[PDB]
Structure formats: structure tokens, C-alpha cells
Amino acid sequence: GPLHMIDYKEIEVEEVVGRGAFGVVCKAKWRAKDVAIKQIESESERKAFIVELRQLSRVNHPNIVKLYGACLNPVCLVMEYAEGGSLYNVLHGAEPLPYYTAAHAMSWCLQCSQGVAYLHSMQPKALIHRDLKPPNLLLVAGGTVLKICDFGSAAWMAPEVFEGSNYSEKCDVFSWGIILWEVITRRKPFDEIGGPAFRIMWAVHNGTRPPLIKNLPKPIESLMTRCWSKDPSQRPSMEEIVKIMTHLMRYFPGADEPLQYPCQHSLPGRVEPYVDFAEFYRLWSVDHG
């Protein structure tokens, strides 16, 4: 149904959970649901939320954060709270960081692709995320369920977008490619390059891509490298990514295992994965030969 108008009086505001470019976000209770609220800061975002009300209204998917509605004083969005916080944080946050498995990596990436596929399939205007990256991917259910919100980005942006060439939903497929590499290696993409953003843009615009991964199963490598293609039209669609990923999950059982084990973690042409593919090659062997 459409989005609610909400009395700010009905909202008990607890801690701040994230101050960044987006603005500020806080935990809260509302009709005793846990919620996250974000003040809309500007006249700028206030306005584009408002042109898109019919579309935001219509989004509903398990891997997209539920938008409950908005208050009008102060103007703020009211949203599903994700106790787990960002994927970026799970991957690269402050010690102590959690252990996770290849199965988790693939699952997260599958869930991301399900949510995005849905936005691409919206009728009649396909929603394109344009900013898909681990800081906008949030986790619940002990780290096992991933949810896109917000339906230095340079390291996940497709060259045609920063290049200013008019773009499609394929830009999201590029981002997802990078995300897949990121969760598998537990490395920040293009961290070696850093400097400022334009150094990355320049590099990527020149065909530079994250390093290949030792011993990555070939089908996952093919998918990943196909998502990274310069030519958007050579990238798969998300609908296709979803079905490949869904079918690979047979070889990555245990993704429903909540994060809980600790990890002390550090980094060495090519890179080792963080996750281990041995159980995959085993289960894969049983099926084939």
C-alpha cells in the first residue's frame, strides 16, 4: 500500500547508528517496531523522494529495506531497522571482525542480486540503483539476510557512469561484480590505488580491474569477469545473475549460519580468497566427476 504520514510524537529516538554523506541515521521505536530514521537534510533530496512517491510506494521485497513512511516535522524517512549494520562494516570494520564462509559470501551476493533484479523489473520505469556498494547493504538475522537500502563510490562505479555516457541498469551489474570480488577476497577494491577518487576513475576507465583470485572456481570467475566488461551490453542481466547464483547455492550450504565466530585477519599478480572453496570443489565433484 502507499507510504504513511507519521506523527513524529509516535517516535522514541535512541542512539545515532551512522553519520555520513547520506546525513544522520538513528535507532528508534515506533508502534513498538524497531526503526531507523534519517532526517532528510536538504531541499534537494526532499524534492526527489517526492517526484518518486508512486515508485517508492510500490517497492516491496525481502532484500530491500522496508520504507514505512515519513514524518513531516521534522521531515524524515522511517525505515526498517537492520540490527546487523552494513556489509562494509562486517567486511572491513573495526576489530574484532566476524568470521564468515564462502557460503555467506555467495549468499549475500545472491540476495543483493535478487533485490536489484526486482528494482530492474519495476513497471513501467525500471529503478536503477546507480550506487550499489557494501555500505548500502545491510544485514539482519545474525548476518544471514542482506537488504539493500538507499534505493567515495568510485571503486564500485562502472566506467560509463563517471564517464558521463548515458547509462542503463547494466551499471548495477558492474557494481555487483566488484562486490562479489570484495566479499570473496575480503579486500577493499582498489585500496592499493587510493590517492583521490579520480585516480581510481582513471584506472578503471583504462580497463584496470581487481586482481584475479587464486583457485576461484571457473564459473564464478566467468560471471565476475563478465560483470566487469567495459561494454555494458556484454554484462549479464540481473535476472540471469540471480538464476546462476541461485543454482550455485547447492554447492554452498550453510549460509543460514549466523555470524558469531571471531576472526583475526590480515592481508598478503593475483590474490588469495578469504573464503575457502574446497567444500565447493568437493560437492561439485560428487555431482559431476
Ligand SMILES: CC(C)Oc1cc(C(=O)N2CCN(C)CC2)ccc1NC(=O)c1csc(-c2cccc(C(=O)Nc3ccccc3)c2)n1
Ligand atoms: C550503516 C549505518 C548507516 O547504519 C546502521 C549501523 C548499525 C550498526 O552498525 N550498529 C552499531 C551499534 N550497535 C549496538 C548495533 C549495530 C545498525 C543499523 C544501521 N542502519 C539501519 O538499520 C538503516 C536502515 S535504513 C538505513 C539507511 C542508511 C542510509 C541511507 C538510507 C536511505 O536514505 N534510504 C532510502 C532512501 C530513499 C528511499 C528509500 C530508502 C537508509 N539505515
